[PDB]
């Protein structure tokens, strides 16, 4: 029983055209991961903190704690 003729040309061409996509994918999916995992957290964490922030209630607890020179 005869073997059938395989792909014999541009074998290394084929290998690259396949994997160039795989590296776009890895990177671009490391792109998404960073947005979720880090950047969009920072923006969520500053907005969440400052939303219900009373800078006088900060100053007050800091003053009772004895840290300031100007405010005994």
């Amino acid at each position: 029983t005869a073997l059938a003729k395989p792909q014999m040309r541009g074998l290394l061409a084929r290998r690259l055209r396949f994997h160039i996509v795989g590296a776009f994918m890895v990177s671009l999916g490391f792109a998404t991961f960073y947005k979720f995992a880090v950047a969009e957290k920072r923006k969520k964490a500053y907005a969440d903190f400052y939303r219900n922030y009373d800078s006088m209630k900060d100053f007050e607890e800091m003053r009772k704690a004895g840290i300031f020179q100007s405010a005994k």
């Binding site: 920072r42 964490a45 500053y46 903190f49 900060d58 800091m62 704690a65 004895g66 840290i67």
Partner: peptide, 9 residues
């Protein structure tokens, strides 16, 4: 912690 070093993260 009394001066709230880095209180956002």
């Amino acid at each position: 912690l009394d001066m709230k070093v880095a209180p956002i993260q």
